[PDB]
C-alpha cells in the first residue's frame, strides 16, 4: 500500500500500516486476526484515512511476504503492538480487532491501561467457548496433514453461503501465502486462549480496569448467539454490541461503512473527556 512501512521490533522485522495523518488523538489501532495482514483493513482504512491516524501492525511472519518464525502468542502480539506504538510516539489509541485479534485487544487494554487505551472495539469474535465444529477446525489447523483442509472448512463458515467477491479475494488470494507455520500456530494459540481464559467474555469481565468495549459482528446469525451478547450487555454497563447484518464474518471488508461509524462513535466519545 501507499502507507506500508517496516521496522525492527526486538528480534523480528514487522511491516505495519501508518497513514501518518497529523491530527488530534486518539490513534486508531486496527489489529489483524491470525494468518492475515493489513489487507483485511484496506476498505476500513479508506473510511478512516482522512479524519484519523490509522496504525495496522502485522504479526511475526505476517505480511505481503509470509515467513516461518519462532512460536509466539497474544502476549508477544501486545508487546509487538506496543513497541510499534512507542517508535511512532503514539500515546492514546483506540484498538479495533478482527476475530482472534481480540485476545491481543483485551490483553492490550490490560497492559496499556484506561488512560492510553480508554475503549476498544472487537469485530466478529466468537464470544462463547468453541462449539464442536470450531473445536474441530482448530484440531485440523494444528495437524500438519490436514491444516489446509482446516482453512477450507473455516472459509465455508466465514462466507456463510455468500458469493461475496471482496471476502472471497481476502480468503483465497490475500491469505494464500500463509502456511502450516501460521495456521498451526493460530490453532495452538486460540485453543490455549479459550482453555486458559474460558472465553473472550470471561477475559473482558476479568480486566483489572473494565472499559467501554463494543462487539460489532455479522456472524453467527442465530438467536442463541445474540442472546449471550444481550445477556453480557445486561450484566456489564461497559459492554455493548451491534449486529451489523453483513453477509460474512468480515464486516471490515463487506460493511466497512458500518464498522467505521461504530469506530468513529467510540473515537468521538474519547475526544470528549
Ligand atoms: C483471519 C482469521 C480469522 C479467524 O476467525 C481465525 C480463526 C482461527 C484461526 C485463524 C483465523 N484467522
Ligand atoms: K454476491
Ligand atoms: K451494557
Author numbering: 3 to 275
Paper text:
They catalyze the O2-dependent breakdown of N-heteroaromatic quinolone-type substrates with concomitant carbon monoxide production. Atypical for oxygenases, these enzymes promote the activation of the triplet ground-state O2 molecule without the aid of metal centers or external organic co-factors. Kinetic measurements indicate that their reaction mechanism relies on a fast initial step, during which the substrates' 3-hydroxyl group is deprotonated by the His-Asp subset of the triad, thus promoting its activation for molecular oxygen attack (step 1), whilst the nucleophile is not essential.
To prevent turnover, we next synthesized the substrate analogue 2-methyl-quinolin-4(1H)-one (MQO). MQO, a non-reactive molecule structurally closest to the natural substrate, in which the hydroxyl group at position 3 is replaced by the –H substituent. As crystals of HODH251A typically diffract better than those of wild-type HOD we solved the X-ray structure of this variant in complex MQO under normoxic and hyperoxic conditions at the 2.0 Å and 2.1 Å, resolution, respectively. MQO is held in place by a single H-bond between its NH group and the carbonyl oxygen of W36 at 2.8 Å. A water molecule (W1) is present at full occupancy at the R-site underneath the A-ring of MQO 2.8 Å from its molecular plane. It is stabilized by an interaction with the main chain amide of W36 and the side chain of S101 which is observed in double conformation in both molecules present in the a.u. with trans and plus rotamers refining at occupancies of 0.60 and 0.40, respectively. W1 is H-bonded to S101p 2.7 Å from its OG atom, whilst S101t (OG) is more than 3.8 Å away.
